Amino acid sequence: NTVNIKTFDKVKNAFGDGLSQSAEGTFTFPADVTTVKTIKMFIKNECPNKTCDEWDRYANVYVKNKTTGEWYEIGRFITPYWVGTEKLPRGLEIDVTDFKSLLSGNTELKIYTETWLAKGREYSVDFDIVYGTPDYKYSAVVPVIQYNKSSIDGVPYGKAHTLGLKKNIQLPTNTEKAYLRTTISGWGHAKPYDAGSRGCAEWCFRTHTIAINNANTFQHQLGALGCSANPINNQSPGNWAPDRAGWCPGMAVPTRIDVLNNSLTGSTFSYEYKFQSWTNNGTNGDAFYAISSFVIAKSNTPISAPVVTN
């Protein structure tokens, strides 16, 4: 079984006086998610005849955690230059199965675009829920860190001292499978440039590390994705083809999945996101990393949300 749920219908994120960069709404999702195998989120950006903010703007979607009243980023993308997602049949696709526990019953969603023009961007969002026999009937998800309000509200990169990326995580004793879900994209053309005149953090290729209990465990390489091969190839005269570090205009920001070893099940461990070292000399602007990292706990027996603590 595959149920399609329609959620935002030509909603506009715009900037200027009786307008907003974000839109919200409440939608009804089926209540039972125990047999949900996959949930695909589709984002359609309609921008016919240059009627939208022609820049490659940062955008993201959130689902509200009813109990805590906190917004969780389920997906982000960079809008294409000058056009919408027309070359793509169903729009940008992002797997959001990790958030099935929050995508049930009356769910409030939020979509934001860092647009600075009144014409902004218009979107239609729908979800495909595929029912079946999942490998794990239950899942729980909680954020470890969230500095993703916009491209320039991320974590400053290259500053003398930085903090706010070390946390402690306690996984439920019945966790059968656990993993981290991270989405990271950078902004800026700050100096000193890397070879090839690549400023940070939009252009400079880096490899960040996540340390579990002080041991370097996962590496996140923000390298070339092959922007020139983008299906949305009608973006000229915008600078669409050059490879940025870990993202391309008119494409979803990749979701990075790192599987935790089961020796962490039932125990509290430390998590630290370590940026590859670099110092901003401050002569050519700022550099930021917009980042969200989530811990997902799965089991075939009802499970409570992992505890994240400083």
Determine the Cα–Cα distance for residues 207 and 280; give it in Å rounded to an integer: 17
Confirm whether 272 is a catalytic residue: no
Q: Indicate the helix (H) or strand (E) that contains 292.
A: strand 287-299
Confirm whether 153 is a catalytic residue: no
Neighbouring-strand partners of residue 177: 298
Beta strand 177-194 with 2-13 is: unpaired
Nearest to 274 by CA among 206, 214, 210: 210
Q: Which two tokens stand for residue 241?
A: 């083809």
Confirm if 285 and 188 have CB atoms less than 8 A apart: yes
Confirm if 246 and 222 have CB atoms less than 8 A apart: yes
Confirm whether 56 is a catalytic residue: yes
First to last CA, the chain: 42
Please pick, among 73, 114, 122, 286, the residue that the annotation labels catalytic.
Answer: 114
Confirm if 45 and 55 have CB atoms less than 8 A apart: no
Please pick, among 53, 56, 73, 122, the residue that the annotation labels catalytic.
Answer: 56
Residue 108: CB atoms within 10 A of its CB come to: 14
| Residue positions annotated with a catalytic role | 56, 114, 202
